[model samples]
Target: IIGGEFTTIENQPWFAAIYRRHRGGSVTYVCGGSLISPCWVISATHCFIDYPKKEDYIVYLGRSRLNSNTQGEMKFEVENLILHKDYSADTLAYHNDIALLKIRSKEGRCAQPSRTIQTIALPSMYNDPQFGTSCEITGFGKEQSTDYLYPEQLKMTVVKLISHRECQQPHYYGSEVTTKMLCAADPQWKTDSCQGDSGGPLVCSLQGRMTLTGIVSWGRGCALKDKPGVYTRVSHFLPWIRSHTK
Candidate 1:
């Protein structure tokens, strides 16, 4: 297994199970993703757009650590990629910033009971309009500043939801940010998504099972005093997500 000083996927098993890697040259882009259907995965549109070709990417399931070269039992490949039609990386508007990927054909993988891949339920309805409601985000990013993406392990963090109005502050994302396509995180600065943690799931447990509420979109920095992390509101895209998956 890949060894590192950061959090281990073994410790955060649930989060680590869903973490994915986008390998390109010497740089391995780390992003968070969730299974929304047997053949499809939901993740940030930005994550996949940079590498439009599916052949350049590989999706790993049932792995909590980076054993790409050592642990041979937990790696999987993707056959197709379906990004939002309106996605534009140049402007960074992140409109409909979610994408879906079709996994390659493998016995006991996508739909297999023993497969580590599993789909997360989407929220049926939207509620809780205040900032105090509890939420959780999971990713395979760096633990401390200056560190690159942590190997194989996933990191989960708890954060509070905040209003778009408060998140538009000058000290925060400011006017450049829009509520139409995004939702704000609590400006605690102490807890937030960082560079390597993009496109992961931001989930909330309501009744029993966890429902996906957001996708790690972008943020100024990790735990920056006033800059709250931004996420793509999953609720807003429920119809689109359902239509595509169904």
Candidate 2:
């Protein structure tokens, strides 16, 4: 079942003390993300755009949640935004939907550590075995329908990856789905992403390291029976991702 906390950084002292203060908050109208590198972060391109300005958002690193008030964490400024050139908002098509946010590291702050931001390794090949695997998802989204943001300890959930054909069933997502643009999660009514959870990482562990394989894209609804959440397929955009980030 879906599992996780729904508070901010300051609210969870225990999490703050543990996890080496490596986690932080990601804000978006309908997406989520994590700090994979000091200067680069991984998220969906749709989250990067749709908003008129880039400075409207900030990435808070090394805190447990929003209210951490740790007095000495760091906040990074977004210096550049790189969305895939093939991205299209019209059909909600997410081909090459991955994006790299170039962050500005401040010297020191209460909100983050000196080297708080860390780079997560990318899957070396698109055919990585992590595909069709079960993994954990974390984000600060609504606790229930009609509720506001739960900026507490990031929430967690388990989702099993499903194949593109299975995802496009008439009872499921239908033909609008494309293999190159999407990946499917298990159609469990109780486990899915909702508002405020977009752009978050869909991660799997390979060879002892966590690698992101998808970014929350969209779904018909939150936890609807027979309807699974869809995400941008990170593997499909590997070359574009590496070229733009490096």
What does candidate 1's lDDT look like per residue over 78-124, in tens digits? 67677888765433345667877666545545533233445667776
Question: Could you tell me which 10 consecutive residues in candidate 1 have the lowest summed lDDT?
Answer: 1-10
lDDT per residue, candidate 2, 1-246, as tens digits?
A: 133434443322111111112125443333467555446667777765666255555665555454454444556556677777777764534555667666665553223324333445666666444346786666665656456665555666778777777777888767767776555465446777766667776777766767776677777656767777777777677787778667
Superposition TM-score, candidate 1 onto the true structure? 0.79
TM-score of each: 0.79, 0.77
Model 2 residue 10 distance off true place after TM-score fit, in angstroms: 14
After superposing candidate 1, which stretches have Cα over 4 Å from the reference? 1-29, 67-74, 89-93, 106-109, 113-117, 125-129, 149-152, 180-187
Model 1 Cα displacement at 207 (Å)?
Answer: 3.9
